Each structure stands twice: as structure tokens, then as C-alpha cells.
Amino acid sequence: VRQTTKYWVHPDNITELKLIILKHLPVLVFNTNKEFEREDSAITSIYFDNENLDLYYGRLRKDEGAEAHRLRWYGGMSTDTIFVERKTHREDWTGEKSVKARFALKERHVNDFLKGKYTVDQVFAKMRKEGKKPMNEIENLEALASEIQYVMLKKKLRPVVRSFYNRTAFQLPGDARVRISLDTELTMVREDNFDGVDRTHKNWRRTDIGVDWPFKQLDDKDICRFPYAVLEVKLQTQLGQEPPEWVRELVGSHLVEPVPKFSKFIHGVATLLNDKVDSIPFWLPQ
Numbered sequence: 001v002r003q004t005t006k007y008w009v010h011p012d013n014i015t016e017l018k019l020i021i022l023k024h025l026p027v028l029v030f031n032t033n034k035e036f037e038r039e040d041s042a043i044t045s046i047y048f049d050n051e052n053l054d055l056y057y058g059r060l061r062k063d064e065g066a067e068a069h070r071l072r073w074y075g076g077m078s079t080d081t082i083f084v085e086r087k088t089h090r091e092d093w094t095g096e097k098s099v100k101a102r103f104a105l106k107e108r109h110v111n112d113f114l115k116g117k118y119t120v121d122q123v124f125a126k127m128r129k130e131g132k133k134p135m136n137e138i139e140n141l142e143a144l145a146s147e148i149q150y151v152m153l154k155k156k157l158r159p160v161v162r163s164f165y166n167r168t169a170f171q172l173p174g175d176a177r178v179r180i181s182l183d184t185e186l187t188m189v190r191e192d193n194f195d196g197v198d199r200t201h202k203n204w205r206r207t208d209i210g211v212d213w214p215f216k217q218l219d220d221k222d223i224c225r226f227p228y229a230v231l232e233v234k235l236q237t238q239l240g241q242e243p244p245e246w247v248r249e250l251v252g253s254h255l256v257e258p259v260p261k262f263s264k265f266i267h268g269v270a271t272l273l274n275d276k277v278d279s280i281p282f283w284l285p286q
């Protein structure tokens with residue numbers, strides 16, 4: 001039985017919270033000399049929606065099967081691998097869950113793929129020729145890309161909001177019973193053209209910013225700098241036990257404020273496009 005919960009952490013409690021967590025878990029690193037640079041912690045996602053904000057309202061209401069679509073990259077602007085991600089809301093007898101699916105795309109193919117000029121077959125031609133990944137897994141990836149490309153074209157999606165943050169991952173590899181992520185420098189940026197300003201110049205992302213937080217070059221109206229860190233806890237507790245004593249104590253501690261349905265996508269749209277949306281998540285006024 002796996003649970004996921006989200007919390008806001010005041011800047012005054014970030015360090016104290018870090019010290020607690022690191023008592024129990026390692027931090028993941030991705031360079032072999034175990035050294036890291038500022039940009040290594042960067043995660044950037046470009047969320048797509050259409051002008052009616054269909055996907056936003058779907059996610060807000062938690063419609064069954066409501067999709068969010070985002071193009072994400074890790075690290076700095078030299079990163080060439082772009083993950084095309086689809087997150088799907090599920091509900092049934094057992095309760096709720098989130099289903100994530102993605103496939104990887106070279107940056108230079110992104111625009112062409114989103115316009116349906118670069119086909120899914122063309123997208124995976126090199127992967128098939130290689131013969132490294134099993135055929136069925138490839139077929140299932142292709143099916144995902146076709147579904148995503150279809151919705152992007154059918155629903156006329158375009159870039160709407162960017163989320164940026166630095167993420168620390170606390171995790172003892174080979175033990176997913178407990179996984180914790182702390183997100184700082186959380187920022188949402190406008191990518192839409194709803195006020196007539198062609199922010200991306202028809203690219204899939206703005207190019208007038210990189211990962212250079214705090215992004216002082218942005219107009220005030222194009223950016224929301226989030227005051228708190230966001231803590232996410234991913235539990236896999238072996239039935240029928242309870243979560244570890246240190247985890248349960250933490251979440252209930254004054255250090256963190258639970259915000260059940262929090263979503264960077266929803267927060268960004270509602271804050272940045274506040275005059276446009278007709279419904280607002282419940283962590284915001286009305």
C-alpha cells in the first residue's frame with residue numbers, strides 16, 4: 001500500500017527539516033565523483049493547455065482520467081534530453097492515484113513532433129534499429145507518443161505555464177519504502193500567449209530565461225515566486241504495518257503544513273492567469 005502526501009515548508013523551517021530527514025536517508029547524486037553544481041538540482045517543466053484551459057479545469061475538478069501534459073528537463077540549458085510526460089488522475093473503489101507516463105525526445109525534434117511533422121514512427125526509428133529495448137516495450141512507448149501527439153493536436157494544446165524548482169531527493173536506493181523530495185526556489189512562469197504577447201515565439205519553451213533563478217529579467221506579471229518549499233513524501237508501507245515512526249512524527253510536526261491536493265500546474269495557472277480562470281484551487285482565496 002503506497003501513499004503520497006504534499007506539504008508546504010516555511011523558509012524558517014527548511015534547514016531544521018533537512019537535518020531531520022538526512023538522519024535517516026541518503027541524498028541521491030548523479031556524478032560519479034559525487035560532486036554537483038548549482039544547475040544539477042534544477043527541474044523545469046513546461047505545461048501545455050489550450051486557450052479554454054481544458055486540462056486545468058479537468059485537473060482542478062479531479063475528473064477521472066483528467067490528463068496533465070508537460071515537457072520536462074533536468075539540469076541546465078545544455079540538457080538535450082526532453083521528457084514528454086503525461087500524468088493521469090485515477091479514481092476507483094480503492095481510492096485515488098496518479099499515473100505517470102513519459103518518453104524521451106531530443107530537444108531539436110520537440111517542435112516538429114508537437115506539430116505532427118515528425119511522426120511517432122520517425123521518432124522511434126533509431127530506437128527500433130538499435131534493438132536494445134524489447135519490442136513490446138517499444139510498441140507501448142510508441143502507443144503513448146501517438147496518444148500524446150494526438151491530444152496535443154486534437155485539443156490544440158500549447159505552452160501555458162512553466163514550473164521551476166531545485167529538488168533534493170532523499171532516498172535509500174533499493175529501498176523505496178520511503179522516498180522524500182524537497183523542492184525549493186519554486187517558481188511559476190507564464191509561457192502562454194493569451195494576452196497577445198507571443199512569449200515562446202512559437203517554440204515549445206521561452207528562451208529568454210534558462211535556469212537562472214530568480215529570473216529578475218521577467219516582467220512582474222509573468223512570474224510567481226513561491227514563498228515556501230514543497231515537501232513530498234512517497235510511502236510504500238508493507239501491509240499491515242504503519243509508516244516509520246520518524247516519518248509519521250515529521251508530517252504531524254509543526255515543521256510542515258499539509259496541503260492535500262497541491263499542484264504546481266494548478267497553482268501556476270490560477271496565480272498567473274487569475275483574471276482568466278473561473279475556478280480556483282482551495283489553498284487560494286475562494
Ligand SMILES: [Mn+2]
Nearest residue numbers: 006181232264
Ligand atoms: Mn510532485
Ligand code: NA
Nearest residue numbers: 080106107108
Ligand atoms: Na537536440
